[PDB]
Design a protein around this ligand. Structure first.
Ligand SMILES: [Zn+2]
Ligand SMILES: [Zn+2]
Ligand SMILES: [Zn+2]
Lengths: 53, 26
DNA sequence: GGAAATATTACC
DNA sequence: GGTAATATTTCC
């Protein structure tokens, strides 16, 4: 059980909680090199990259 | 994504994800 | 094991 | 169409 202190939600692991806490901090460490859009996750930046083609 | 919902046509990588999803139509 | 990636979902 | 978020699965 890996609960967020700011909201009640729990997460399967500590990294999952880490990823979730970015919804509170606005941390978005994954930045598209083509347009500069920032993402909380590498998976989402990855998907976003296919929109440039 | 070989697993197709015969209600809404969405494809899914595994039959588990399709099974999970088919409940949304109940 | 848990981090990381992936798949999916909820939105609009 | 493409985000934002997370559940599920994959991977060292
Ligand atoms: Zn939270
Ligand atoms: Zn971009
Ligand atoms: Zn369906």
């Amino acid at each position: 059980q890996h609960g967020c202190t700011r909201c009640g939600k729990n997460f399967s692991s500590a990294s999952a909680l880490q990823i979730h806490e970015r919804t509170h901090t606005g941390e978005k460490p994954f930045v598209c090199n083509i347009c500069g859009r920032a993402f909380t996750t590498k998976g989402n930046l990855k998907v976003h990259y296919m929109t440039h083609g | 994504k070989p697993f197709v919902c015969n209600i809404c046509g969405r494809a899914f990588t595994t039959k588990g994800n399709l099974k999970v999803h088919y409940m949304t139509h109940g």
